[PDB]
Structures are given as C-alpha cells and as structure tokens.
C-alpha cells in the first residue's frame, strides 16, 4: 500500500508531462525531475515472463526507485540493476525481506538498512 500509493502518484504526474519529454529541449528542473522519476518507475514496472515475485521483493524494488535511489541511474540499466539487486537481497538479505513481510510494512530499521544496501550496491554497479 505504502510504496504503491507513491508510485501511482508519481506516474500520474509523469503521464501528464510525458509528451513534452522528447521535445522539452529546455525544461525546468520541476518537470525535469518528474520525467526522471517516471521513466525509472516505468522501468521497475517491467518484469520478465514466467517469474512471479514475492510481495517483499516487489516492495523492495519499488522502494529503490520511489525513494529516488535510481534517479541518477541510466534508464537502460535499471532493468539490469533490478535483477542483480534483487538476487543480492534474496541471497544476503533474507532477514530484511523477512522483516518487511512479518512486520507488515517498512519499519524505520528496514528503511535504514535498505538505504545502506541500495546506495552501496548502486556505487558498485556504476563502478
């Protein structure tokens, strides 16, 4: 509920300026940030076939973008990030995924630990 509400709000703003994108040669930082989130979120909405993910993995990936962590990442890479990131959390961060589940939502701790994982993971990815 939490992450979805935010993404839906941001995609709706994105759909509004979406057309001006590829023709906004000189767009103001206001609408420019809306286009960046939107693409990122759109990318996170892609999913390969035959691989349905668990709700916690879903929230973790949505989190990454809806929290702006992937705003500076190049849109073409998002998909690659997502798979590598998700494999990493499924491997080394089962406890975090468990917490997100059991705790019902994203607790302050979980939110904090996510911050550390994405930011460091991203840096290695862009390395």
């Amino acid at each position: 509920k939490q992450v979805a509400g935010t993404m839906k709000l941001e995609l709706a703003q994105y759909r509004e300026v979406a057309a001006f994108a590829q023709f906004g040669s000189d767009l103001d930082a206001a609408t420019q940030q809306l286009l960046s989130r939107g693409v990122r979120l759109t990318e996170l909405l892609k999913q390969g076939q035959y691989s349905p993910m668990a709700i916690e993995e879903q929230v973790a990936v949505i989190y990454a973008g809806v929290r702006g962590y992937l705003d500076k990442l190049e849109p073409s890479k998002i998909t690659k990030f997502e798979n590598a990131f998700l494999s990493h959390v499924i491997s080394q961060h089962q406890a975090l995924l468990g917490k997100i589940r059991t705790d019902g939502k994203i607790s302050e701790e979980s939110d904090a630990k996510l911050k550390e994982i994405v930011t460091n993971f991203l840096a290695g990815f862009e390395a």
């Binding site: 590829q22 023709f23 040669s25 076939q49």
Partner: protein, 157 residues
C-alpha cells in the same frame, strides 16, 4: 475481419503483411510490429537473437510514434539522440527489405538468401551505431549487411 481474425489463434507464428509498407517499396511488406512467433523466447532462439529482435521492434515503435509529431512540428525539435534513433530506425526499416529469388521479375534485382547469423549481426550493428555514416538507401533491397557497405560505396556520382 472475422475470417482472418479467428485464424490467428490457430497459428504458432504469424507474418503480417501491410499495404502501407508495400506502398513504400519495402518488400517483403512485413510489419515488424505485428508479426509474432511462439518461439521468440530467449530460452529458445537465444539471448543475442532475442535482444536484437526486441531492440529492432523498439526503435521502430519509437520512430513510429515520432513520425506524426515531427511531420508537423519539424524535425529540428528532435534532440541529437532522438534524431539519431530516427536515422537508424529508417536504416533498419530498409535493411528489413530483401530481394526475393522469386521476385526477380518484379524487383529487377538478384534474389538473396541471408543466414540467421548474418541477419542478427547486421541488425545488431545498426542498432549499435556502426553504420551511422552510410546513407539510408544503402540498406535498401540488399542481402547481407556487407552489401550495404558495398552499395554505400557504389554511390560515387
């Protein structure tokens, strides 16, 4: 139309021809955005094949969307990257055409058969930028990508 429409589900692969594409002289007049295959899966035709193919459809759909817009607003509004994808979309569109052995009485060209690998390679190279310097018309009605470079040369004056 009910007849064609109901036939679709009976197929494993569909090649859909378009009069609009034929009218442009693109033969075979196959619609790159409306032809499908059950086997178009990374796990069957493989990753390189799969990515290339989707990569071609994508640039072609992107172009298709800018067409109508830039035809009114002028191409000058396109950014370099955009007018870059526009250039390669048209080249890809032409490299999709091919002289058929059976169509020599119509094309006035010698038919050509291109092996899978060569098809993949050439398109992969156009998507990748490797032929931004050859004029579009070099890609029109040829076989292997190599002929695209030859024809490009051929055009001397």
């Amino acid at each position: 139309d009910p007849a064609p429409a109901t036939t679709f589900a009976h197929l494993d692969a569909t090649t859909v021809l378009s009069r609009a594409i034929a009218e442009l002289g693109i033969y075979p007049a196959v619609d790159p955005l409306d032809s499908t295959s059950r086997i178009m899966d990374p796990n069957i035709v493989g990753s390189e094949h799969y990515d290339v193919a989707r990569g071609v459809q994508k640039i072609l759909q992107d172009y298709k969307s800018l067409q109508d817009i830039i035809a009114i607003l002028g191409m000058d509004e396109l950014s370099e990257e955009d007018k870059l994808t526009v250039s390669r979309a048209r080249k890809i569109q032409r490299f999709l055409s091919q002289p058929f052995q059976v169509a020599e009485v119509f094309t006035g060209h010698l038919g050509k058969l291109v092996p899978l690998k060569e098809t993949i390679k050439g398109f992969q190279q156009i998507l990748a930028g490797e032929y931004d310097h050859l004029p579009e018309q070099a890609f029109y009605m040829v076989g292997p990508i190599e002929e695209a470079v030859a024809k490009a040369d051929k055009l001397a004056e």
